[PDB]
Symmetry: C3
Subunit: 239 residues, 3 copies
């Protein structure tokens, strides 16, 4: 069907499965992506998710051929974003395992992930620039935060394909692995993260995400709450 979910211990892999359309995401696919990540989020046995496109490419963005059919992307001010989970701030991390193209709304999904493991011949890019479809799944918010305003404006204005090696030098890809290996390497990294003390990891991440836009004083006070949140685990740390 459209999205598959697989689990191995505390790692959940969410798989986009529309290879005939280069994993473009239409309305029902966006809903299945949301359902999958909502379930991951409430599942206390799952610690880390991996997002992966089956078929050799990650995600080509919104399914243009579905424009004005009943399968079109949902576009509303509240509820899920058009690409599915792009507005959610999950309680636990997601690693993107990027093969082939992560472009347009597919780039937005990769940016919504906490880390990106890219294959050597992967390409990241704002390819919706060529066809006049806007970034409305957070790309204009997240890209500049991730890699700095200058590099981000370069990608956003030109729409150019950034290859994996350049993405690694920009900090857009966090790891670059051989062709075919992103899923496995993402899943290995995920399992490593799952084996660390979880409350503290989780609270640190959400502090990193929430600090953007905040003044330092407030961001420091948000962060400080971690010690009360994880106090159980931090006790077991001093030991």
């Amino acid at each position: 069907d459209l999205v598959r979910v697989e689990r191995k211990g505390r790692v959940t892999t969410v798989i986009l499965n529309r290879p005939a359309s280069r994993n473009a995401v239409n309305g029902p696919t966006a809903a299945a992506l949301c359902a999958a990540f909502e379930q991951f989020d409430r599942d206390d046995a799952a610690s880390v998710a991996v997002l992966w496109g089956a078929g050799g490419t990650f995600c080509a963005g919104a399914d243009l051929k579905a424009f004005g059919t009943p399968e079109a992307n949902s576009v509303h001010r509240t509820g899920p974003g058009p690409m599915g989970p792009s507005r959610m701030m999950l309680s636990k991390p997601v690693i993107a395992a990027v093969s082939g193209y992560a472009v347009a709304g597919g780039l937005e999904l990769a940016l919504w992930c906490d880390l990106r493991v890219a294959e050597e011949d992967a390409v990241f890019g704002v390819f919706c620039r060529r066809w006049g479809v806007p970034l409305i799944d957070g790309g204009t918010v997240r890209l500049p935060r991730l890699i700095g305003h200058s590099r981000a404006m370069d990608m956003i204005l030109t729409g150019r394909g950034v290859p994996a090696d350049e993405a690694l030098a920009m900090g857009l890809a966090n790891r670059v692995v051989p062709k075919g290996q992103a899923r496995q390497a993402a899943e290995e990294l995920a399992a490593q993260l799952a084996a660390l003390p979880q409350q503290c990891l989780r609270s640190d991440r959400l502090s990193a995400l929430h600090q953007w836009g905040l003044p330092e004083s407030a961001a420091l006070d948000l962060e400080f709450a971690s010690i009360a949140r994880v106090a159980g685990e931090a006790l077991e740390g001093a030991r």
Copy 2:
């Protein structure tokens, strides 16, 4: 004569034209840059601008010799900044075509631009650090956003010259081209941008600018107005 404007289709090139003062910007030059950008912003036939300094150099900053004279930079809390257009948020992008030095206020004009195409030989730097004149044309605001706080603080505190290759690795230069090619490479990049669908390009650009200083959720709310506009 202080500033020339040349058009090629939907690309307007604004040219700083005081090579004998290393393209330092005094009060009248700043006013002329403002007027040229105001006109570009209002011009429905112009899509992308290029900012380029004639005669081998981009801009060495404020014309400090003009201080105390009627040609002195105007320094006021509102209206144009001292270098000219550095407080404007344009509806459309500008590419800086950097040769030679982009220093002090000249670095601030380059940071105000959306993209920077630099020549191999070009140097970027906070050289006003050495002279004891403050950055008040957005350098302290824009540089950390462009390349991160750590690198920006190195540049700002030290005032060191950053050559084009280092600038490209920091993300400060977007493109590096051979000596004398900055104008042409910028104009070519501009024409490529002018050939894409424009409403969506301009919308995405403004959203990337405004998100800084909104937290995530509010910034996502704001970007979602692009759906309305275009």
Copy 3:
């Protein structure tokens, strides 16, 4: 003594001096670090500070062995942070001179400094990730602003050690120097900073710090106040051309 303070010209060096604990910071160490920096902030004879760990390593973070002793770190929502000066906004810059490990709370002290000079074999890392102790001295705030969110999230999630050369490529280290030379190289760079016109330098720096979080138009207004703060120096600067 837990912390030593030495003055060389206009450069004050604050020295973490517990090499047998890998320069872990307990309660009384943190209090001595705050006092050293508060004294710096008000000393008109000092322009720039350097923070340096003695004995081969920068700082291993909070002193976990001291939890439940009278020397435990003070952990309170207001006032000084648990590592000591990590919530202070100083009026003057501080350069971290990193040898060996700057990890956990030690990384956070290095992040709190304006610039980092690292030895070629130094390592930066969120090592508290392994022990399950949270970052509460500003690491989750400052790391993303310093190096971007993607690279910061890598370091924060994994807890991996980032060697000096990779740290230089990420923008986390600003300078990389040979083994044994962090202190001297940081002090030399500090003396360079101290030789520049100090009012513009200090205002530019604070504008760069306060702009984070602000829309550009308000941030430009804050920056514009520099000209009133530094008018005497800027007038002198103008008159030399």
